[PDB]
Subunit: 149 residues, 4 copies
C-alpha cells in the first residue's frame, strides 16, 4: 500500500535522492542548484509548481516522485497541468506508485479548476506506456524542439 | 516581402480572421469570447503570452499568425517558450511566412533570455513538417493526455 | 522447459486452438475454412510457409504458435522471411515461449540461407515490444496500405 | 502527360538510370549485378515480380519506376502485392508519376484478384506521404527486424 502526498521540507532528501536517480535514468546531469531552486518553487504557495512523493506506508520510505506545474493555453480559458517528471523507485517491481501519483495530480487538478493534465515519454519506453494507456491516451501529435535545445 | 511584428489593438480584426480559419483547419470551435481573452493576454505587457502577425510588407494586410507563451520547467532555471499556434493563408502559406514567423519567436525568445522554444502538430500534418524539420527538429517523444481532456 | 518444433498433422487441434485465441486478440475472425488452407500450406514441403508450435515439455500441451513464410526482395538475391503470426497462451505466457519461437524462426531462416527475418506489431502493443526490442530492433519505417484493404 | 506500362527488354537501361538515382536517395549501394537479377524476374512471366515505368508522352523518356511483387498471407486465401520500390526523376518531380504509378499497380492487382496492396517509407518522408495519404492510409503498425539484418 503506497501513499501519495505533497512534499514537506523534510522530504527534500527522499525527493532529491530520486531526483539524481531520475537524472541517471535519462543520462542527464543538472546543476547542483536546481534541486534547491525546484524544492523552493515546490514549497512556495505562490509558484504554481508542485511536487508529490509516494511514501511507503509500511516503512515511511519515499518510493516515487512527481513534479508538475501550471501553464496557460491559447485554447480554453482554463490553464492546464503538465507532469514534467515522474519516477518511481528502481528497486521494486509491480507495486502501484506512478499509478497512484498520476491520480493524485488528477485529483489536485480537479480541485484547482484545471483538470486538463498531460505529459510525455520516449517512444522507446514501453514499460511506462503500459500504465499511461490505462490512465490516458497517446495524442497523435509530434513534438518539435528548436535546434540545440 | 512580408514583415513580422507583434500585434496591436488594430490587428485584432485581422488576427481573428486567421484564428477562425485556424480553428477550421483543426476542426474545432472555440467560444467566440475566448478570442477576446487571448488578445487581452497578448496585449498585456505583464501576462507572458504574445502573438505576432505576418503582414504583406508594402501591401498592408495580414497573412500569418503565431501565438506563443512562456512557462516554467523543472529541468532548468530559465523558463521556456511554447508556440501554441501557427497559421498562414492557404496560398501565401509556402511563400516564407511560417518560417519567417518561427524565426521571430526564436529571435524574441533570445532577447527574453528564454531561448528554448518548442511546439508540435498532428503526426499526419506532413505539409507543415516539410518546414518544421528545417527550422527545428523532431523529438523522439510520444505525447500523453488525461482521458476526456 | 519449452520445446519449439515444426507442426505435425497431429498438432492441428493445438495450433487451431491458439489460432482462434489469436484472432479475437486482434479482433478479427477469418473464414473457418482458411485454417485448413494455412495448415495445408504448412505441411506442403513445396509451399514455403511454415508453422512452429511451442510444446511444454512436462505435459504435451501446445502453448505457443509462430507462423512465418518466404518472399522475394528487390534489395537482394536471397529471399526474406516474414513472421506473420506470433501467439503464446495467456495463462502460459509467463515462461519464455515467444522468445524461443522467434529464435526458432531465426535458426530455420539460417538453415535456409534466407536469414533476413522481420515482423510487425501494433504501436500500442507495448508488452510484446518489451520482447521484440531485445530479439530485434525497430525499423524507422511507416507502413501504408491501400484504401479498403 | 505520362503513361505507365510494364517494362520491356528495351527499358532496362532507362530503368537502371532510376535504380541508381533511387539508391543514392536511400543512401545505399546494391551489388554490381542485382539490376540484371531483378530485371530477370521482372521479365520472366512466371516469377510474379513486376516492374513498370512511367514515360513522358512527348519526350518518350522514362520518368519513374515502381517495382512490386506478389506474396502469401496467413490472413487470407488471396495473396498481397507489395510495392517494394517507388521513384520519380528528381529533374522531373511534382507532376503526376507516382500517383499514376501506384494506380497502375492497383489496376493490375485488381485483374490479378490480389487487390491487397501495400508499401513502406521513412517516417520522416513527408514529401512522399503527401501523396501516399491520398491513395492509401497509414497502418498503425511498427515494423521490427532481426537484430543483425
Amino acid at each position: 500500500n503506497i501513499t501519495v502526498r505533497f512534499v514537506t521540507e523534510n522530504d527534500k532528501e527522499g525527493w532529491q535522492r530520486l531526483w539524481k536517480s531520475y537524472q541517471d535514468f535519462y543520462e542527464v546531469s543538472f546543476p547542483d542548484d536546481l534541486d534547491d531552486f525546484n524544492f523552493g518553487r515546490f514549497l512556495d504557495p505562490n509558484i504554481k509548481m508542485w511536487a508529490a512523493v509516494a511514501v511507503e506506508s509500511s516503512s515511511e520510505k519515499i518510493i516515487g516522485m512527481i513534479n508538475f506545474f501550471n501553464h496557460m493555453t491559447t485554447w480554453d480559458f482554463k490553464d492546464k497541468i503538465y507532469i514534467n517528471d515522474l519516477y518511481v523507485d528502481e528497486n521494486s517491481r509491480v507495486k502501484g506508485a506512478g499509478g497512484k501519483l498520476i491520480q493524485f495530480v488528477y485529483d489536485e487538478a480537479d480541485k484547482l479548476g484545471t483538470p486538463s493534465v498531460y505529459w510525455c515519454t520516449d517512444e522507446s519506453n514501453h514499460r511506462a506506456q503500459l500504465l499511461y494507456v490505462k490512465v490516458g491516451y497517446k495524442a497523435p501529435k509530434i513534438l518539435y524542439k528548436r535546434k540545440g535545445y
